[PDB]
Each structure stands twice: as C-alpha cells, then as structure tokens.
Design an enzyme around this catalytic site. Structure first.
Site, PDB file in Angstrom:
ATOM      1  N   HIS A   1      42.890  43.275  85.480  1.00 39.66           N
ATOM      2  CA  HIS A   1      41.658  43.155  84.689  1.00 39.66           C
ATOM      3  C   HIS A   1      41.909  42.357  83.409  1.00 39.66           C
ATOM      4  CE1 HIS A   1      39.998  46.161  87.417  1.00 39.66           C
ATOM      5  NE2 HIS A   1      38.810  45.850  86.921  1.00 39.66           N
TER       6      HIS A   1
ATOM      7  N   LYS B   1      38.611  57.072  90.491  1.00 43.44           N
ATOM      8  CA  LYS B   1      38.424  58.492  90.138  1.00 43.44           C
ATOM      9  C   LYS B   1      38.135  58.664  88.661  1.00 43.44           C
ATOM     10  CE  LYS B   1      43.369  59.670  89.708  1.00 43.44           C
ATOM     11  NZ  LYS B   1      44.523  60.540  90.029  1.00 43.44           N
TER      12      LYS B   1
END
Length: 184
Positions: free
Chosen positions: A43, A110
C-alpha cells in the site's frame, strides 16, 4: 411482512458495481475469479507510485484486495499453503486515497476499517470480514497463482495475483451505504 433474510452471493471478478451496491451488512459472500493480496508495504509503494503517475502492475479498480501475507511454496508452480487475514486497520491511512479513483472495489480482511474508509466506500465498495478459518483450509480455494509482483518486498508483503473459486466465506461488514458492523 417481508422478513429480513441473509443473502449469499458468489461474487465474480472483475466486479460488477451494481452487485456491490446490492450488498447489505450481514450478507454472506464468496469470491470467484481473481483477487490479489496486499498489505502495509504494498500500500505504501502504491501511494508513492500513484502520486508520481507511475502505472501500477495491478489494478484496484473492479478488483478485490485481500489484506493477507500468504505462505507460498514453489514446486512446478507457486502454490499457496496459507492465506489467513491480517488486521485491516493498518491499511486505514492508505485506503481512502486508493478508493478515490475506483468505480468500485472490494476489500477482504479482519477487524474492519475506519469511519473515513466507510465514507470513502459510499456508492462504490464493500468490506468483507473473512470468516473462513485460520487460512490453511481457505487456501484450498486458490486454484492458481497467476503471478506475483513486487517480490522484493518479501513473500508476505508481495502482491500475489490469485485465481480463486468460492474463496470465503466472508460476511459483508461495511457496505456501500455508510453502514459498518464495527461502528462504536
């Protein structure tokens, strides 16, 4: 008299925007088609390349990104051995910028994502909470490693391009309408 029901979708990639918009929090989703893995390093590099106008070697648009550091073995081909989720909140700082230019996208992880991400997803994206176990059995839904990019980031941080059949289950936990299971 119309009772609320849990819908189950097998979502195919490249994503169809109207199918993302139809999702409600609590729906069950499986993914079939291509997904790619990306976490902290990937990222960061993506934001760097984006601001410099360098074309990325994968596309977030109409894609499904899985917050995952996979364990992969190489026989004749790469084979994914484990594909468990990582904590998505670590990607909170990067994700609104990534969502800015997409028509639609999906994210699997998650623990959920921030309210800034929820807002950035409005009208375009959903977040899928992985509920498919520890990652070993889930890996059996990965049929092929199509390729890997940015391998210099190291195996868990590289971007793995995966062909999957009914990857999941996941629960829709942030929808495209400003709802989040994680709120408060």
């Amino acid at each position: 008299h119309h009772h609320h029901m849990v819908m189950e979708y097998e979502l195919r990639t490249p994503l169809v925007k109207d199918q993302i918009l139809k999702l409600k929090v609590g729906d069950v989703v499986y993914i079939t088609g291509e997904i790619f893995t990306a976490r902290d390093e990937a990222h960061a590099r993506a934001l760097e390349w984006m601001e410099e106008g360098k074309e990325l070697p994968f596309s977030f648009d109409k894609g499904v990104v899985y917050h995952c550091g996979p364990l992969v073995k190489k026989n004749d081909e790469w084979r994914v051995v484990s594909a468990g989720p990582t904590t998505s909140a670590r990607m909170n700082p990067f994700t609104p910028k990534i969502l800015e230019k997409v028509e639609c996208m999906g994210i699997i992880g998650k623990g959920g994502m921030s309210e800034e991400v929820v807002e950035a997803m409005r009208g375009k994206a959903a977040y899928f909470a992985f509920t498919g176990g520890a990652g070993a059995l889930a890996a059996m839904s990965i049929k092929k490693v199509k390729g890997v990019v940015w391998e210099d980031l190291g195996m868990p941080e590289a971007v793995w391009l995966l062909e999957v059949e009914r990857f999941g289950p996941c629960i829709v936990a942030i929808d495209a309408h400003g709802n989040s299971l994680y709120r408060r």
